[PDB]
């Protein structure tokens, strides 16, 4: 009866940091994914299940729309079978992922002069995430034998680091906003 609310998740005013990525559930709606496809404003529109053009031609039980900010350098890791700080400790797609990964510059919005330190990523982790896991804990990383006692110092590290997003950054070091649509009754087109 009414359109899927994709402007809420794509056009939203702020995005999550990748370690605490947001996920929007989407049911009881109908939308064409071609207000998306023919936008021509996307740096990545890497799809896995289906072809991007023929997408509003099909129905699924549920669809999720995950959204975060990473470095464009790093959009490489938002795809099944990747490894790296981000695919391992921040956001991991499963090997049998069916959906699309969408990205675009954000240097206008998410870049502050002198550095927008709001956006973070998980740098330390004893073992890397399972598919679609979210770990927002902030306990001091124990790299030594000495216990950390919650105090940051040598071999006792804060697991999150802050992007120094600056407008003068090369495009690899620029903010990119990313939306991951995954598909598995109630969505159609």
């Amino acid at each position, epitope marked *: 009866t009414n359109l899927c609310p994709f402007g809420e998740v794509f056009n939203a005013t702020r995005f999550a940091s990748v370690y605490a990525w947001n996920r929007k559930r989407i049911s009881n709606c109908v939308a064409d994914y071609s207000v998306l496809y023919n936008s021509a404003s996307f740096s990545t529109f890497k799809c896995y299940g289906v072809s991007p053009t023929k997408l509003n031609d099909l129905c699924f039980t549920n669809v999720y729309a995950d959204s975060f900010v990473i470095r464009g350098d790093e959009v490489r890791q938002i795809a099944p079978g990747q490894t790296g700080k981000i695919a391992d400790y921040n956001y991991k797609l499963p090997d049998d992922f069916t959906g699309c990964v969408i990205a675009w510059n954000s240097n206008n919005l998410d870049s502050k002069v002198g550095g927008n330190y709001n956006y973070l990523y998980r740098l330390f982790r004893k073992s*890397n995430l399972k598919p679609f896991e979210r770990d927002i804990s902030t306990e001091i990383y124990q790299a*030594g034998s000495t216990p950390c006692n919650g105090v940051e110092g040598f071999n006792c590290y804060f697991p999150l680091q802050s992007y120094g997003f600056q407008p003068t950054n090369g495009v690899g*070091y620029q903010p990119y906003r990313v939306v991951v649509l995954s598909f598995e009754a109630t969505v159609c087109g």
Partner: antibody
Amino acid sequence: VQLVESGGGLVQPGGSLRLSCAASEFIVSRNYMSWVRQAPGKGLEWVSVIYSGGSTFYADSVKGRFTISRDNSKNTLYLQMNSLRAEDTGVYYCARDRGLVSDYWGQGTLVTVSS
Amino acid sequence: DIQMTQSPSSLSASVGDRVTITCQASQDINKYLNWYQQKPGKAPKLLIFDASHLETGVPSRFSASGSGTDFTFTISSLQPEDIATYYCHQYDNLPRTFGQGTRLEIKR
């Protein structure tokens, strides 16, 4: 408080070797580690890295021939060197990466690849 | 496959001078260059990491700056224990690279 390397020596071209780097305050299984080599009187060459989560990466120069691994039970980082060539001769250093910054370095062992 | 090019190869300066090593990246590396000192026969010392930050325990005469491609490492007051080869090291792109190396000789 230190990284103690061993296992380097003389190996036949095409031979095999495994280096050891045993640690004293760091925990290899919880920490970032990379192997860096230096052929005699030449520059440095980063070779391999292992992440806290276990993900491994190699320089194309040694990929498929070398393999980085660790044993928590002995707190030791290894570098297996298979199919050795002459240009693999040099000093091999292990380093603790502070997540991509190699801050503490081992003193090195000499892998000499000659007939 | 980012190529780091330092200069000079060889450098001769007398005690207390101001010594300056530059290192330029082929592509963009942001602040993810860091600077090493390798005394003859020992392993390298990390001096400055993240392009500009002084590693815990290092003398204040060592300093470096730069972001993107052009980087500068500077010794403010040359000392006798500073003979070594100094290397810049790119670390954020996969194939990690070093510069050529700068052989520093004390003049006397």
